[PDB]
Each structure stands twice: as C-alpha cells, then as structure tokens.
Amino acid sequence: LDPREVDSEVHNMDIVRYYPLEFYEATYELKSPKELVGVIERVEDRLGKPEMYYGL
Amino acid sequence: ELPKEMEEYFEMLQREIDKAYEIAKKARAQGKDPSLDVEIPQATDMAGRVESLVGPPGVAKRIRELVKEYGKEIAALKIVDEIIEGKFGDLGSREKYAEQAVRTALAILT
Amino acid sequence: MENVKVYGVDKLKGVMGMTSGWKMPEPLEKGLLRAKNDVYVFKDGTIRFDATDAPITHFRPREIGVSVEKLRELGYTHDFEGKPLVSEDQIVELKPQDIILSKEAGRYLL
Amino acid sequence: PFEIVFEGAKEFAQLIETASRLIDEAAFKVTEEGISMRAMDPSRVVLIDLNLPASIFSKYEVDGEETIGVNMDHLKKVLKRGKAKETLILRKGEENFLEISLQGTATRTFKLPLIDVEEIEVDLPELPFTAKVVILGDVIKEAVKDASLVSDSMKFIAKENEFTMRAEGETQEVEVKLTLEDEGLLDIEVQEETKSAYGISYLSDMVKGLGKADEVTIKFGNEMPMQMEYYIRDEGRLIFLLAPRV
Amino acid sequence: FGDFVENNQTLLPANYCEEWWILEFVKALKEIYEVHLEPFTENEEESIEEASDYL
C-alpha cells in the first residue's frame, strides 16, 4: 500500500487528537475551510515522509 | 526509509502471498485447466499495474524515473511524447500510435 | 462423478450459452463440489461476497473477539500510546491492510 | 456370490426409505453375522445405525465378507416398486452389479451397478443417559407435527411417572404431557431431572413413517445427544443419535 | 472537519461542547495561576497537585 497513489479524497482526512481553540473561534466568523487548512493536520501534510503508516 | 515495524509487516504479507502462490502454481501445472500457469500477476506500484494492463512493454522504469523527476501529469505527457517518437518499438500506422498513447496516458493519470 | 467420488448431488445448474469468444467450458468436477458444498460461481470462475464498506483506524481486542496472545502472534505489540499491550481494553492501531470481517462473511467463507 | 431372501418386501422398502431420508450415499457391510450400515448426514448432526441379523432373513448364504455401495435414490425407487405380499431376493455375483428380484405372480429383476463410496469409520459408544422412555409412534408423530405447527425447536422434559414435551415460539406455544396410566406411555425410568432441546426438521425426518402400533424407545439426558431406536421383527434394530442445540 | 474541506463547504458555528470547555478551562487556569496542563494526555504530578491545591 502506497498512500501517495490511492485516491485524492482520503488526503483530506484528520490525524489530530483534538481540534485547537483557533478552529472553534474561527467557526463563529463563518470562514471557509481553506483558510485554516494549515492549523489542523491532515493526511496530505504527511505524504512523502516515513510516517504515513505510523501514527494517526 | 520505513521504520522496523512497517517493513516487517509488509515482509510477512509477501511471505504469506508467496506461500499461497507456490501451491497455486503447483496445482495448475498438471494441465486440468485452460492454462498451465496462474493468470493473476502481482504488481507493486502504479508503473507495474500500467505495464501489466495497457503496456507497452518496458514502460515501467520510464514511468518510475519520470515520476521521480517531474511529477504525475508532466510524466504522463513525457511518456506520451516518448511513445509518439517511438522509443518502445515500432507499432504501425498513426492510428495505432494514437490509440496506444491515449490508453497509456489515461492509465497513468488514473 | 467417478472422478471425484461425489455421487449424492440433487441439482447442478449450468448456463444456456457461453458468452466468451472461445466458448471453453469448465470441468464438471468443480461444479459437483460447488453443489456439494453450497457455493455459487461468477462470470470469471470465482466465488465472491458483497458487503457495505465502513472505515476504522483503531480497534479494541474485545470488540473483535481476539485474545491478546493471538494479536501478539499476528504482530501487534503496543497500544496507540506506547504502553505494552497487556489487556483487552487497550486501544490498538490498525495496520493498513488488516480487515475485520462480518459474521455472515465468515460463515460463507467457511 | 451370496444370496439373501426376505418376506414382505414392503417392510424392507419402508425401512430403506426411512434410513435414506437423511443420508444419500451409503455402504452396506455384508457378513455372516448380518447386513449392517452406519453413516452420517452431511451436517454431522444425526447418526444412523442399521443392523439386520442373519436370523430375520428367511434365506441367508454368505461366504466371506465384502462391502457394497449403492446410491440411495435408485435403490429406494426399486424397493418401493415392490408390493405388500412379495418376496424380495437380493443377489450379488462375481460382477459389479447388484440384482434385485421381486417374486410374486411373476418375476421382475432389476440391476444396479455398484459405486465406490469412500468409507469413514465413526461410532458413538454408550453415553451416561439419565432418562429412558418407551412410547408408541402414533403419539410422538402427532406431537412433533403439532410442535412444528407452532415452533422450530422442541424440548424434552422427563420426570417420575410422567413424560412431557414442549415447543416455544414467537407468539404461540404448545405442550404435551402424559403419564403411565395413559396408553401413550408403556414404561419409564428416571435417574434425575432431565431437560434438553433439539431441532424440529431432523425430528420430523426421522419420526416420519412410524406405524400406529409400534414400540419406540427413547433415551436422553441433560444437554447431551438424544438416542431413539425401534426394533424390526424383534431382532433387527435401527438407531438414530441426534445432536442437541447449544 | 476533512469532510468540509473536501466538499468546500463554509464552516458553521460550533455548538458548545466539552472539548471546547476543557480548552477554555486549561487556558484560564494557566492565565490566572500559571499552571501548565493539557487535556487528553497525562500531566506531571507537581502541576496536578498545585492545581488541586488552588482549586
């Protein structure tokens, strides 16, 4: 299995234990999810490095 | 590369697959079937799947190196160009070249 | 029947006409054994089971009814926080190519 | 090259039909002691044992011993072709064919080539039974029909001087009980409290065809397989061992 | 949250839940008494004792 060439929808999944306070504070402003895509870690943020299989 | 657990996992999986494949190959050799060998090859990455499905033969290494260098879409375009110029062998008329190139490119980008 | 020593079969269904371009038939011994064991064939000669797919990343050794000794034999040794795997209530992480079947699937695959 | 004769071929045909309602491939062992059969159904739930001594048969001449495998469908049809007051003659020459002859007003002979059925030896010795009961077929047949009318499983409970059998369903229930004073009970003996459950399709298959005035002996225990037997001509014995549920 | 990114859907205001209250709780504790704690994990014993003495 190579997560780099499986699909493109599974690259948007979450691998965080809990959402930060910034996410909840920004939800009240009706923002778009592309603005805070770097705040919450996703699968795409780990591609290439050895820990795509390791810790989710 | 991978740590000392993922590699062991994949190695055990390959060992079990080999263990099943040996029996399947041994049984099919006795000739009680349409063919004298198993009819499902095993791939490992995208280049192997593309080579086994649409061809042309030998495209696996070229896809590998082109993906390492440029990317996915650019590597598909360079593979199309190499097919058109005729690196992998003479096919025939322009229709054959067009069909082969479109099939291989749609398989790569997919 | 003399070949496989399976004489007690009531029904054995075939096809009206082969759809391939070779119209090569299948050995009747396989059909007799399938009828004896109550399994059915598909268009390419394989037996398949269809189910809805759901995701999972972490499991618990008690939800799936597997002892910790068996899990350690399979290759799992730590839970998802680094502690050694000693209980059935700890949360373990699922390797990418490990599946948890249903029970209808297990009954049919038997 | 043996030769076996029977009187009242209808009884033999009914016996073979009863024994062939659970198994499909059977192998009969022929010895000087007598014809015997032992096989298991595909589900391995019911065990069938059939024993025909040499005393019941009118004429018996066997020199040696050899097993014969016959498919149950053809044998059942040929035997069912017989009548009430016919004489059944079974023969097996040096060839691989079985000759069945029905002797009445005229002689009619059938032939059945033998088949090679693989033989697996499996026997269940005596078990620590806790209850015994002797009843007639007429009743047990009616009770199992009534239980199948209502449910899919049947329960057997035995106590002193009484025999009770029950079945429970989603919306309806049925129970039948009787005592020694009733004609439905001939004898009974109890070691301790008993309770067990078994499937109803198997019971329907095994108890089907029982006569109105035949003696049937049943033994069972707690959460252990049931055994039921009934004699033919007071020498031959037919045994069913039914595995329980859970 | 990855289902909102994939379909490109505008974020909706979040109903109050325990996973927000716990973050507010730990932040207020740090701001007032200068104690460092963290939810969903295990903390040092000195910080636990100090926070329990304060509260």
Curated annotation (Swiss-Prot), chain D:
Pfam families per record: PCNA_C (PF02747), PCNA_N (PF00705)
InterPro entries the UniProt entry points to: DNA_clamp_sf, Pr_cel_nuc_antig, Pr_cel_nuc_antig_C, Pr_cel_nuc_antig_CS, Pr_cel_nuc_antig_N
Keyword DNA-binding: yes
An example Gene Ontology biological process: regulation of DNA replication
Lyase keyword on record: no
Domain of life of the organism encoding this protein: Archaea
GO molecular function, one term: DNA polymerase processivity factor activity
Entry keywords, A to Z: DNA replication, DNA-binding
Summary of the function given for this chain in its UniProt record: Sliding clamp subunit that acts as a moving platform for DNA processing. Responsible for tethering the catalytic subunit of DNA polymerase and other proteins to DNA during high-speed replication. Regulates activity of NucS endonuclease and prevents non-specific cleavage.
Record NCBIfam families: pcna, PRK01115.1-2, PRK01115.1-4
UniProt subunit comment: The subunits circularize to form a toroid; DNA passes through its center. Replication factor C (RFC) is required to load the toroid on the DNA. Homotrimer. Interacts with NucS.
Family: Belongs to the PCNA family.
Protein name in UniProt: DNA polymerase sliding clamp
Native species: Pyrococcus abyssi (strain GE5 / Orsay)
UniProt gene name: pcn
